[model samples]
Target: MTEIALIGNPNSGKTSLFNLITGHNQRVGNWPGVSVERKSGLVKKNKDLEIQDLPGIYSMSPYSPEEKVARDYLLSQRADSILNVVDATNLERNLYLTTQLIETGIPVTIALNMIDVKINVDKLSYHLGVPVVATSALKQTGVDQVVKKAAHTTTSTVGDLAFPIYDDRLEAAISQILEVLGNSVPQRSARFYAIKLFEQDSLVEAELDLSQFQRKEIEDIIRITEEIFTEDAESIVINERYAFIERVCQM
Candidate 1:
């Protein structure tokens, strides 16, 4: 069955949307050993499609147990598309995770929950380069549109979203890493992996299984970037991403 994973920050009305879409058919369980609840059900209009409501998370860095659960699922390609539920009133904070989700190479559709609140859905969708549906799960409005749009989207058909452009030095480093990672990582996800590698993400490093030569090349690039930027690689990436999010919100 085709699966659509619902992801968002905590208290973003993710579960409420799931309930609106699935109603009586939903099943609830824990995510393996974790206390985080997992909910899934067949879409009412489309029995061929299944919706999995993942634990709400702020980011995909996997620093916390709940974040790891959501991160692993997305990176593992368990879901065909992602329903990124965001709080309409808090676009900036919500879009933080949305940016990371776009990097996953999965088609993402934004469900801007609490539509009763003030927000410009079109402008948000235009800037983010994905379809955005205003929803009010509490009132059961526009839930069908969210599911239908998500079901129809595919990685190949996903929009061209704007990614953060780091400083020239970091851009050069990313380019070099992308060259080294050619064909080793999926083309759509190469940029994401390159950023993670430069930031020295342990899980990404282990997953990439870089050889000694490749490791040295990345290290040299990161070292050069640190020298040029006068900031640690991790901090550079974190700050730049937040900066881009701020720009998007202001636009």
Candidate 2:
């Protein structure tokens, strides 16, 4: 089944755009409640496609529960592809999350929601490798093109490696974990999952089952990482993720 996850910063009209496709054929659920409201439904153009409306988030780092819900879902690979809705008027802020999504190794399509009000943001589309379809939920224009592009997309690769560094200790720990686990997960994605595990991300940890001995080895890596970083491994992981992102923004 083709699954699509709609994500964006607050007021980016992500949900509004999702509504435009699914119309009244939507339902709402909570991400464990108290965390986020997960809205999902089937699109009329493609009944086989399942669409999920992820929580609004400023970035992938879990600074708050809301952000965690969105990031966790993506990291968990709950959705097959992402429909990253961005406000064309404010592309810079929206691109912050766009870079992180690229790291998750998920295929992304940038739904440039609400571009009619903008004058000089066309250059922003080049940075996001996926199809860029302008949409105005309020005006109900450009939405069909967005749906057609998302539904017909055949290529699936991570957004782009926008950030490529990690703290030395964390990087070493990821290396150790990958070395220990060796070819257990698919070769293409093992490193990504290994790094997430070192961060003590609950969602990623739950996805893979480790034997008792393997779990102990993993926890030991996290402990060493925390001791050297002087913060929990999770904090170090998230801090470095954003730090790398900020560094790229400067370049």
Candidate 3:
């Protein structure tokens, strides 16, 4: 069955929207060994589609178990598409997770929730290279349309994705990392893995099982990036995301 992964920051009306869409059609369980709950449900009237409500997280870096659970699923690339629920009033901050989700190569559809209270939603859709639908679970508006958009989206090429550009130095670093990665990873998901490796994700480092030469080259690239940027690898990427969002919100 096709799955639409539902994810968002805490307090983004994610649970409410899930309930609205799934109604009484739901199941709950723990996500593996982690205490974080796994909530899945069949989409209303669509027997073919299912929704997986992942734990709310600020970023995919995985500071805690719940965040790790969320990241693991994204990295696995099991879902056909992601329904990124974002609080309309909290757009800038919400878009932080949005940026990371976009990098995953799975097509993302934004549920701009809390709109009953909210961008040139079109401009956001343009810059993020994904569809954005203004929605309100409380008012029961536009929820159906967002799911429709997500359900129709196909997995897109990493080469064609409008991934936000980073500093030129970091971009060079990422390209180098990708070179080390080479064809080990599929083209569709290479960019996501490249960026994660560049950011020095510990879990991903263990998971990739890279050759010594590849690992050495990636460490060197990251060391070079830290020296040039005067910041840690993760810091550089996190700050860049906010900086990009600041620019997005400014316009």
Candidate 4:
């Protein structure tokens, strides 16, 4: 079966896109450890495609509980490709998380959501760099293009060009945690998970099944990183990403 995760900012027509893809064949429920609801269903042939509509979020840095719900699920190895639904009107901000998702080294496709509301899709495409498809989920337009993209995509590696670097201190903290947790987790870039763990993110620690020793080591690193940084890890992590995004927008 193929799996796809629909992620976007609040009211970016994510649920509408989900409905467009799956129609009446959907189930809605709350995500674990958070109040934000999770909606999921199958599309295409029966059981051929699985889709998880993540809680709408402002960003991936997890400042708020809703963002955390979406971030936690994204960190998990559950989805084959991430459908980054972006409101075309909000291109500047949407590209921020687009940068972050590329850092996760996961395959991601951009759904240029809300074509009817916004007139300038080309301007967004000039900046967004990823494949952008016009979609008006509410009007049931461009849904097939999204499905076709998802159906044909084979998850691929995102390199340095796609993944941008962040603040020095934040990057250092992630490096430290990754070094401490070696081999206990699979060998991918642990920076993102490390940042989440440093923020005391239960989703990464609990759901991933890290051994007790690995967990304790990560906890110690988090404690020390928090002490040195003198701020909540999650807050700092998210803020830095936003700061980076703002800088890019200004430029």
Against the true structure, candidate 3 has what lDDT?
0.85
- Tens-digit lDDT track of model 2 for 114-215: 766543334444444456777776676767777666666523533333334566777789888987776665543566677767766665677677778778
Q: State TM-scores per candidate.
A: 0.90, 0.65, 0.94, 0.69
Better of 3 and 4 by TM-score: 3
C-alpha root-mean-square deviation, each candidate: 2.2, 4.8, 1.9, 4.7
Show model 1 residue runs off by greater than 4 Å.
29-36, 156-167
**Cα lDDT for residue 108, candidate 3:** 87
Alpha carbon lDDT of each predicted model = 0.81, 0.70, 0.85, 0.69
- Lowest summed lDDT across 10 adjacent residues in model 1 is found at 155-164
> What TM-score number comes out for model 3?
0.94
lDDT of 2: 0.70
Cα TM-score of candidate 4:
0.69
Worst 10 residues of 4 by lDDT: 154-163
Ranking by TM-score: 3, 1, 4, 2
Clashing pairs in 4: none
- For 95-169, candidate 3 gives per-residue lDDT tens digits of 998888888788888999888763788988887788889997667678888988888875642236678887788
lDDT of 1 at 131: 83
